[model samples]
Target chain A: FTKALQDGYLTPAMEAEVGRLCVVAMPHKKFINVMEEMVLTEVVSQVSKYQKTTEKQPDIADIAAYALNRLPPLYATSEEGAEYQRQRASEELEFLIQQQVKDGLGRYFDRPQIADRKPLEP
Target chain B: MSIQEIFTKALQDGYLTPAMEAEVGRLCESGVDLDQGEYEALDRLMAALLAGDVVAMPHKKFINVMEEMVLTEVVSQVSKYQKTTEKQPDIADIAAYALNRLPPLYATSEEGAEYQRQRASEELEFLIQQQVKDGLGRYFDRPQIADRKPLE
Candidate 1:
C-alpha cells in the first residue's frame, strides 16, 4: 500500500480517509491492519455481486477503481470531505490489491493471462 | 420520421445543442429503446428548456445545464438497473451501458471526467444565479443543482 501510494496508484488523502473509516471499527486498532481487512472484505463482497450479475469476473483494477470512485459518497459530508474521501478510498484499494497479491490471489485480480499449452497427448 | 430524426431536427434547429445531437446519435446507434422513466426525465428537461429556465441562460451555460441534466438521468437509470437486477454495475460497465443508452455527454471517460470537474465551478456559479433569481434560501433545494456533486 505504501509503495502504491508512492507510485501514484494511491494518494495520501485516500489513505487518510480509509484510515479514518477503519478507526470507526475498533478504537485503538492499528490503522493499516484494520484498513487491510476492511478493504479486502468490501472488495470481495462487491466483486461477488458484480460477477453474479455479469457472469464475468471484473478486472482487479476496475474493481479497485470503482470502489475508489463509489465509496466516498457514503461518508463525505461536504465537497472537501468528499474529495479527501475519494483519495482515501484509492489508497485503501491499493492496500487491498497488495494484500491480495501477497496472499497468492494475484492472478485472479491481475490481467487475464493466455492459457498455457494444453495437456500433452493423453 | 423516426424519433432519431426528430431529435436530429431539433439539434439542427438550435433547440438542442451539438452535445445533445451527439447523445441522440449514440442512442440511435445503440438500438436500445429508452424506458418510460428516461422519456419522462427527457420530457421534463424539454419542458424546462421550452419554459426558458435553461434557454434563458447563456449558450455555454445552457449547454452545461443540459449536460448535467443528462448525467443526472444516467445516474438514476444506473441506480434503477442495480435495484431491478440485484447487481451492482462496475463503473466501466455502467459507462459503457450509459454510452449505449444515451450520449457520451458524461464523465465516464478521463477526458469527460476532467470536463465535469471544470464545469462544476461554472455549474455552481449558475446555481447561485438561479438561487438568487428564484429566492431559494438553500443550495440543495434545487433538485437539478443538487444532483451535480463535485466528485460525480
Candidate 2:
C-alpha cells in the first residue's frame, strides 16, 4: 500500500484525501475534524452512487481496508500491534456502546442542564 | 521546502483556517523560543496540512505532529468535554472515553457506505467529548443519530 502511494501510482492529492479519511478514522481529535471533512468531501459526496446500486456486501473487509489505507501506523511498538488488536478485539464492541453514551451525555450538558432535572425522589 | 510554502499550502488545502494561519505566522515572527504550547500550535498546523494533503513529511516531523497535536489535542479535548458535560463529571474519564470513541474504518467493500457510517458514529462520539472539553463540542451536541439509537 505504501509503495503504491509512493510510486506515483497514487497522486499527492489522492493521498491527502486518504490521509484526511484516515485522520477521521484515527482514535484522536486532530483526525476527527479531518475525518469529518473527508467524509463530507469524499464519502457523503459519493454516497449517492452507492445508494443507486443497492447491492449486497459484507461489512468487515471494507472497514479493514479503510483502516489499512487511511489509518496512521499504530502507536504500539512492533510487538504491541498484534497484542493491541488481540486485546482490543476482546472489548471493542462493548466499548462502542459506552462511547455512544459519552457522546450523547456531552451534548446534554451543553446548553443549560435542562432545568427540569427529574424531580428528586421523595 | 520553505516554511512559507508549507503554510501557504496548508491554507490552500483548508487545513489551516485563516485565523490559524495568521496566528501561526505571528508566532513564527515573534522569534520566541519554541515552547510546548507554541510548538503544538505549529505541529497542529503541519498535521492539518498533512491530513488534508498526504505528501510525504519528514519522519521526525510526522512523529512530532502525532505526539503534540494529534494525541495531546485529542486528550485535551476529551478531558474538557467530560468536565463540562457530565453533572457527575467523573462519571468516566475523558481520555479513556475518547479512546473508546475514536472511529475506525476500512474501505474495501460494497458496504463502504455502511462502514463509513459506523466509522463516523465512533468518531463523532469522541469528537463530541473532545469538543466539549475544548469548549467547541457544542456543534455536535444534537440529535444527529436517531436511526442508530437502537444500536446506540
lDDT: which candidate is best? 1
Cα misplacement distance, residue B60 of candidate 2 (Å): 21
lDDT by residue (tens digit), candidate 1, A29-105: 11111222233334444444443353455433333333333222222223554445446656655564445433323
Model 1, runs deviating above 4 Å:
A1-40, A46-57, A64-122, B1-109, B125-152
Best-fitting candidate, measured by DockQ?
A: 2
B64-99: candidate 1 lDDT, tens digit per residue: 122233333333333334334333322222222222
Q: Would you give the TM-score of chain B in model 2?
A: 0.22
Q: Score candidate 2 by DockQ.
A: 0.05
Give the interface RMSD of candidate 1: 22.0
DockQ of 1: 0.02
lDDT of 2 at A26: 23
Candidate 2, residues B1-152, lDDT tens digits: the string is 23454455554443333233345546666576447654664575677656744222111111111122223444333333443442312111222233334444333222443445465555554564453354324224432223221100
DockQ in order:
0.02, 0.05
lDDT by residue for model 2 (A5-80), tens: 3331232333346656651122222122122212222322222233234452112112222323333322221233
